[PDB]
């Protein structure tokens, strides 16, 4: 399936990202900057290997992974986590685990937009991405 996620996406809406970052322990100065950053997400495939790049003026990240295979990940906020990405009900589900905690990053296509839902603790953030030509 994964093919419909592929491409370049830009952030157009964000709800409750501050709650989500607060929940992760992200300091206030970083949250400041993050609240005003509009990342670009690039999803590419080479065979069974996906690469997910997130680019912004603030921080950049890149991960490559095979679906269903665990990998080490250092997140934007400097967490060292164990991650797995799978396709579930047509959604791309990214689970990060560290120190007994979990957060999920779920990507779904709705109406041609990429909706990223981030959950940690009680905090739920929805970020909407639109496809760039
Ligand atoms: C690398 C660009 C990520 C967004 C800007 C900085 C955020 C800094 C700390 C919070 C990071 C929490 C985990 C990643 C959130 C991903 C959000 C997204 O892809 O839209």
From Swiss-Prot:
Q: Which GO terms describe its biological process?
A: brown fat cell differentiation; cholesterol homeostasis; fatty acid metabolic process; intracellular lipid transport; long-chain fatty acid transport; negative regulation of cell population proliferation; phospholipid homeostasis; positive regulation of long-chain fatty acid import into cell
The modified positions for Phosphoserine read: 23, 83
Q: Which UniProt keywords apply?
A: Acetylation, Cytoplasm, Lipid-binding, Phosphoprotein, Transport
**InterPro entries recorded:** Calycin (IPR012674), Fatty_acid-bd (IPR000463), ILBP (IPR031259), Lipocln_cytosolic_FA-bd_dom (IPR000566)
- Which residues in this protein are found as Phosphothreonine? 8, 30
Specify the superkingdom: Eukaryota
Q: Where does (9Z)-octadecenoate bind?
A: 127-129
Report the GO terms under cellular component.
cytosol; extracellular exosome; extracellular space; nucleus; sarcoplasm
Drop me one GO molecular function for this one.
Answer: long-chain fatty acid binding
The record's listing under Pfam families reads: Lipocalin
Q: Which residues carry this modification: N-acetylvaline?
A: 2
Residues that, per the record, bind hexadecanoate: 127-129
Residues found modified as Phosphotyrosine = 20
The UniProt record gives the binding positions of octadecanoate as 127-129
Localization (cell): Cytoplasm
What does it do? FABPs are thought to play a role in the intracellular transport of long-chain fatty acids and their acyl-CoA esters.
Domain annotation text? Answer: Forms a beta-barrel structure that accommodates the hydrophobic ligand in its interior.
What name goes with this protein? Fatty acid-binding protein, heart
